[PDB]
Amino acid sequence: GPHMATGQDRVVALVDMDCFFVQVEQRQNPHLRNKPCAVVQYKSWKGGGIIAVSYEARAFGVTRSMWADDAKKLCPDLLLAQVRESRGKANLTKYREASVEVMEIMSRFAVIERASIDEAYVDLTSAVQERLQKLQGQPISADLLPSTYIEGLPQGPTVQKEGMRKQGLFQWLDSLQIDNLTSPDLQLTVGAVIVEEMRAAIERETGFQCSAGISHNKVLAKLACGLNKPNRQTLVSHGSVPQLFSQMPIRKIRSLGGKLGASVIEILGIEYMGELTQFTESQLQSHFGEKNGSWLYAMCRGIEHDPVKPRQLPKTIGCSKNFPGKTALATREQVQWWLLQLAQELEERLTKDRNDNDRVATQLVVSIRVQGDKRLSSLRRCCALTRYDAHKMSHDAFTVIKNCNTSGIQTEWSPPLTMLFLCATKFSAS
DNA sequence: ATTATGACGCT
DNA sequence: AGCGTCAT
Numbered sequence: 101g102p103h104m105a106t107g108q109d110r111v112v113a114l115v116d117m118d119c120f121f122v123q124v125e126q127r128q129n130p131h132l133r134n135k136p137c138a139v140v141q142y143k144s145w146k147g148g149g150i151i152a153v154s155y156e157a158r159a160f161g162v163t164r165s166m167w168a169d170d171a172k173k174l175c176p177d178l179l180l181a182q183v184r185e186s187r188g189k190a191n192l193t194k195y196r197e198a199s200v201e202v203m204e205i206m207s208r209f210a211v212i213e214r215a216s217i218d219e220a221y222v223d224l225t226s227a228v229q230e231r232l233q234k235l236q237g238q239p240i241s242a243d244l245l246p247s248t249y250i251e252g253l254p255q256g257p258t259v260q261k262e263g264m265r266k267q268g269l270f271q272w273l274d275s276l277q278i279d280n281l282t283s284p285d286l287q288l289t290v291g292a293v294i295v296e297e298m299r300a301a302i303e304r305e306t307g308f309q310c311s312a313g314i315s316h317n318k319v320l321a322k323l324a325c326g327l328n329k330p331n332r333q334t335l336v337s338h339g340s341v342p343q344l345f346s347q348m349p350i351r352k353i354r355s356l357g358g359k360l361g362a363s364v365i366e367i368l369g370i371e372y373m374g375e376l377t378q379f380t381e382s383q384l385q386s387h388f389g390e391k392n393g394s395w396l397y398a399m400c401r402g403i404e405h406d407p408v409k410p411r412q413l414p415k416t417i418g419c420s421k422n423f424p425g426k427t428a429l430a431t432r433e434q435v436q437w438w439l440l441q442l443a444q445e446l447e448e449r450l451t452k453d454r455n456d457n458d459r460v461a462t463q464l465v466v467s468i469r470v471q472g473d474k475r476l477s478s479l480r481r482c483c484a485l486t487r488y489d490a491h492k493m494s495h496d497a498f499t500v501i502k503n504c505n506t507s508g509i510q511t512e513w514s515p516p517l518t519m520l521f522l523c524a525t526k527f528s529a530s
Numbered sequence: 531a532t533t534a535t536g537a538c539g540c541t
Numbered sequence: 542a543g544c545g546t547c548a549t
């Protein structure tokens with residue numbers, strides 16, 4: 101009771117751009133604004149593969165990983181934008197630049213952990229404390245939280261969504277104002293005020309809309325963020341966790357969407373995150389290992405300690421291309437030519453990186469997939485990255501993998517390669 | 531023919 | 542160092 105930690109020590113937010121690549125294309129081409137739209141890679145095969153979908157298009161059932169030709173059957177008026185293609189591969193530069201715009205703004209408010217091209221975690225604990233002092237005990241107005249949902253509210257004794265949002269917010273604030281709500285709850289509330297400000301700054305300065313989650317840890321903040329997309333933010337308090345998790349499928353939680361999550365469900369015979377609470381830590385550790393067990397025991401109670409790492413830049417810089425089915429690379433000249441295309445793009449990105457961020461990568465990782473192999477990578481080899489030189493990088497990459505070629509003939513390559521992937525890693529100060 | 535390419539744990 | 546998981 102007295103001595104039990106409740107995991108309410110921090111205020112953490114997760115900010116994620118709405119249909120990010122689509123908004124980047126919509127900003128540049130106003131014709132696409134406010135319309136069912138998607139972003140695809142390539143064009144020849146089935147119209148290209150969709151990787152981003154505007155909310156207008158999602159209403160027709162359009163989804164990521166759908167072929168554009170197929171999406172067009174669901175949504176005849178779907179507008180498409182295709183990622184830039186350079187050297188015969190996808191070139192995501194425009195979205196990486198857009199990403200920097202957003203990350204730079206977020207970094208003004210607080211320490212952030214870049215989690216993906218379109219999202220960052222924010223540790224707002226200190227910022228909250230500072231605002232609480234400036235506030236001097238002033239009541240927090242609903243006006244300061246124009247886009248915030250309080251998960252779990254309203255409750256008790258609204259037909260329209262904005263009506264529900266407001267009633268929930270009023271219930272929440274009226275309880276904070278009375279003083280019934282905990283200090284952790286006040287802290288989350290101030291975090292939400294700051295996040296409103298962060299999101300307003302992002303929209304004003306970039307034109308991009310986003311959603312956000314505010315809670316006491318990264319897992320809950322990420323979960324919260326997705327609850328009310330698009331263009332809204334959600335506050336998930338410690339107290340909201342029991343009801344929220346009671347019907348929350350285990351696969352919903354970050355890190356549990358794959359094999360581990362499936363084994364939890366299968367071994368324990370449960371469906372929802374809340375059901376995890378009936379097991380002892382030791383039980384969970386025995387089934388899922390010491391680290392995962394401990395993590396699950398705390399998580400199902402809404403507690404997680406993974407820190408927001410101070411990292412605004414990616415740890416690696418890489419590029420890859422698949423060669424599916426019949427296009428699989430089958431000659432030595434072919435492998436080398438594509439290795440050079442990958443290396444050239446990478447050299448460009450690495451040079452820019454060195455200039456902007458005062459660092460140099462020192463290791464080059466080469467990954468390939470062989471035909472018939474389900475795995476992401478069939479083989480990984482590394483060499484020293486001593487020069488930002490595409491010819492040298494591609495030549496070195498070839499040197500470390502050329503062994504894989506079973507065929508006696510130099511010209512032929514077997515087994516055929518279904519992916520090439522060059523990753524620059526092990527950065528150091530420059 | 532689910533592509534491009536990230537972080538990160540285990541050994 | 543080299544492979545497996547989770548992600549979208």
Ligand SMILES: Nc1nc2c(ncn2[C@H]2C[C@H](O)[C@@H](COP(=O)(O)NP(=O)(O)OP(=O)(O)O)O2)c(=O)[nH]1
Pocket residue numbers: 116117118119120121122151152153164217218329330533534549
């Ligand atoms: N190349 C590539 N890019 C991808 C892929 N999947 C996603 N992206 C790119 C395109 C995405 O726009 C972007 C951000 O990823 P999300 O935040 O997961 N989805 P979004 O922001 O689109 O919508 P919302 O958050 O409102 O649901 O990453 C992929 O499989 N391949």
Ligand SMILES: [Mg+2]
Pocket residue numbers: 116117118119120218
């Ligand atoms: Mg997003």
Ligand SMILES: [Mg+2]
Pocket residue numbers: 116117216218219
């Ligand atoms: Mg995202």
